[PDB]
């Protein structure tokens, strides 16, 4: 039942995998490989020190559950999950396997100029799995071009969980590309929205059009200025940001910025597209368009079909509000790796 494994050291780390995964090849933690069982290129992720603390433990279970759960054409699926371990007691390492696509937004945009019809199809596809993720009450907090895989037939898959949270979860502060990232995150709001992801799409989508990075900061205040240079300084409602009363006075100290007309910035863009961005790049997350409503936006006329824009299933997030020791999280997790059912 248990395949022969084999350990080999890749870049200061050990990697014990079953022998159906050949030619492990680091990308950055991830290797690329070739799966003999099926003959597809895959990506293996070894989780970094799971079960190191009560919070990593929790972190690991959560990720795994989510991946097990995602079953949508525009969201990546778990091909395999495994561990070298032969029982719960030696159990300490976790590997996830997924399909390697061929390309991603990151690199197709460095080298091809995308026409509008391209953009439509791609953004709609992104939006369409966001509608799927957000139905499970999940904010994937790391939308960005390299986490958006595309393949030859131009299908799109959203890629990276781990930073994903359930919505009413006290938000924590984290490591990632600041370019695609909502203001409210950058101000460390303890609570925040699924519309944070809409901000990203907004940014990702303007990059497709123009060829360039919308807001290419170099640190947070540079990031925050670049943003204001476009959407303009906000009104007094602003009291809202108590979350950071040291950040509040640093915005009120900032020079006063007029809101730019998007149609004067995005020359040659479809007016429908520019309209849609104007509804994505508002600093007030209350007035920011949802994935669902955005799917209804006329820009997507050509592709919009509700009945193939499905919602996700009944789940138990129950655990989110549990306090267990490491060893509890450990077992819960182990069981899930055992109970894994692999797609055909
Ligand atoms: C450049 C200055 C940053 C502007 C502040 C961000 C406004 C986002 O919106 C805020 O987000 C919160 C949670 O998502 C909501 O609870 C607030 O009611 C809402 O106003």
């Amino acid at each position: 039942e248990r395949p022969t494994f084999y350990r080999q050291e890749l870049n200061k780390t050990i990697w014990e995998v079953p022998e159906r995964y050949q030619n492990l090849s680091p990308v950055g933690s991830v290797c690329a490989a070739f799966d003999t069982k099926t003959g597809l290129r895959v990506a293996v992720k070894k989780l970094s020190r799971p079960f190191q603390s009560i919070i990593h433990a929790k972190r690991t279970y959560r990720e795994l559950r989510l991946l097990k759960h995602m079953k949508h054409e525009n969201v990546i699926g778990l091909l395999d999950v495994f561990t070298p371990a032969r029982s719960l007691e030696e159990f300490n390492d976790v590997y996830l396997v997924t399909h390697l696509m061929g390309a991603d937004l990151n690199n197709i945009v460095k080298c091809q100029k995308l026409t509008d019809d391209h953009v439509q199809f791609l953004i709609y596809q992104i939006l369409r799995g966001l509608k799927y993720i957000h139905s499970a009450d999940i904010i994937h907090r790391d939308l960005k071009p390299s986490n958006l895989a595309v393949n030859e037939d131009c299908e799109l898959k959203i890629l990276d969980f781990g930073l994903a949270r359930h919505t009413d979860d006290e938000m924590t502060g984290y490591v990632a590309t600041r370019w695609y990232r909502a203001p409210e995150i950058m101000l460390n709001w303890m609570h925040y929205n699924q519309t944070v992801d809409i901000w990203s799409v907004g940014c990702i989508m303007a990059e497709l059009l123009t060829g360039r990075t919308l807001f290419p900061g170099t640190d947070h205040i540079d990031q925050l200025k670049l943003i204001l240079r476009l959407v303009g300084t906000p009104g007094a409602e602003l009291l809202k940001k108590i979350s950071s009363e040291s950040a509040r006075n640093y915005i009120q100290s900032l020079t006063q910025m007029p809101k730019m007309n998007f149609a004067n910035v995005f020359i040659g863009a479809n007016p429908l597209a520019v309209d849609l961005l104007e509804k994505m790049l508002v600093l007030d997350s209350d007035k920011r368009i949802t994935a669902a409503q955005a799917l209804a936006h006329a820009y997507f006329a050509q592709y919009h079909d509700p009945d193939d824009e499905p919602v996700a299933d009944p789940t138990d997030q129950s655990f989110e509000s549990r306090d267990l020791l490491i060893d509890e999280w450990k077992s819960l997790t182990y069981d899930e790796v055992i109970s894994f059912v692999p797609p055909p």
Side-chain angles (χ1 to χ4, degrees):
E1 263 293 296
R2 167 183 184 286
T4 23
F5 281 69
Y6 76 103
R7 7 165 59 235
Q8 64 160 129
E9 175 178 35
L10 300 103
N11 192 8
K12 231 102 298 169
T13 335
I14 220 63
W15 279 73
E16 201 142 26
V17 304
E19 48 117 83
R20 68 191 285 234
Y21 305 111
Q22 298 279 77
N23 311 145
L24 300 201
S25 281
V27 185
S29 69
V30 198
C31 295
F34 170 75
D35 170 32
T36 76
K37 216 119 275 52
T38 323
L40 304 169
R41 310 187 246 285
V42 290
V44 197
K45 180 189 204 162
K46 183 181 175 169
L47 302 198
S48 307
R49 251 167 304 100
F51 341 124
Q52 197 228 318
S53 76
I54 311 82
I55 306 198
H56 281 71
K58 184 144 178 172
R59 265 226 275 271
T60 287
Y61 184 71
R62 184 164 49 223
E63 187 161 1
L64 176 18
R65 295 228 86 209
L66 253 41
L67 296 175
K68 277 193 83 180
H69 166 64
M70 310 287 79
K71 323 244 238 302
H72 188 284
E73 291 157 31
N74 283 119
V75 185
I76 190 78
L78 193 55
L79 205 128
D80 198 17
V81 53
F82 69 80
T83 186
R86 243 168 282 234
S87 55
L88 182 76
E89 22 288 358
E90 334 157 326
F91 179 57
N92 233 89
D93 296 284
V94 175
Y95 308 69
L96 306 170
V97 186
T98 63
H99 191 246
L100 185 56
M101 276 262 277
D104 60 22
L105 247 31
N106 186 24
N107 51 255
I108 88 110
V109 72
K110 164 69 200 320
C111 65
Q112 279 159 327
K113 177 101 210 84
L114 299 145
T115 71
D116 180 78
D117 314 280
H118 299 326
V119 185
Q120 277 173 1
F121 186 57
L122 290 176
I123 294 307
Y124 166 84
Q125 287 192 94
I126 295 180
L127 268 176
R128 184 183 148 211
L130 230 40
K131 192 214 162 153
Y132 179 93
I133 299 162
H134 293 172
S135 56
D137 276 314
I138 291 168
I139 312 172
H140 171 306
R141 303 124 79 199
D142 194 27
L143 288 201
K144 76 192 206 189
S146 77
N147 275 341
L148 296 159
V150 52
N151 77 1
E152 295 94 334
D153 298 321
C154 325
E155 314 141 21
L156 181 137
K157 257 111 200 318
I158 303 160
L159 285 192
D160 200 334
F161 305 65
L163 302 173
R165 297 298 184 259
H166 172 310
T167 292
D168 210 68
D169 205 21
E170 324 79 280
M171 298 304 179
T172 235
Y174 66 100
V175 175
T177 316
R178 70 195 110 74
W179 295 349
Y180 304 91
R181 163 219 217 74
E184 51 273 30
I185 315 177
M186 288 179 298
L187 298 198
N188 313 101
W189 242 266
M190 272 78 198
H191 284 91
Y192 53 62
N193 240 29
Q194 289 162 33
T195 57
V196 292
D197 290 343
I198 305 304
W199 182 275
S200 304
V201 187
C203 286
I204 285 174
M205 161 181 179
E207 179 158 3
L208 318 180
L209 281 188
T210 74
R212 270 268 59 235
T213 303
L214 185 46
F215 294 131
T218 51
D219 46 326
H220 272 194
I221 85 296
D222 169 36
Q223 196 55 22
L224 259 166
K225 297 156 66 180
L226 291 178
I227 277 168
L228 296 191
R229 277 198 130 242
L230 186 74
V231 300
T233 143
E237 137 269 40
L238 204 287
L239 316 169
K240 261 161 188 167
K241 168 175 46 238
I242 36 176
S243 292
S244 206
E245 293 129 39
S246 70
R248 164 137 80 276
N249 306 82
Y250 186 75
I251 84 92
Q252 304 169 336
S253 80
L254 257 25
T255 139
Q256 306 268 9
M257 292 294 201
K259 164 72 168 26
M260 297 287 100
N261 176 250
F262 276 19
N264 283 8
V265 176
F266 300 95
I267 314 298
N270 201 314
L272 286 205
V274 150
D275 211 63
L276 178 77
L277 280 183
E278 225 140 14
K279 312 209 180 68
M280 277 166 165
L281 299 180
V282 311
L283 337 142
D284 182 11
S285 66
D286 318 333
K287 323 185 199 273
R288 208 178 291 162
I289 198 171
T290 82
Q293 314 171 131
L295 284 160
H297 192 280
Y299 192 42
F300 302 112
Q302 195 173 329
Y303 306 98
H304 181 53
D305 183 346
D307 307 340
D308 224 343
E309 285 168 8
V311 114
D313 258 344
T315 69
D316 230 324
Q317 299 294 306
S318 50
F319 83 82
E320 269 291 10
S321 49
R322 281 161 212 279
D323 146 39
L324 338 162
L325 165 52
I326 268 194
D327 290 339
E328 297 160 270
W329 296 119
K330 194 113 100 60
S331 165
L332 291 195
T333 296
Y334 184 68
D335 298 337
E336 310 292 304
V337 169
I338 270 72
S339 71
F340 178 68
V341 149

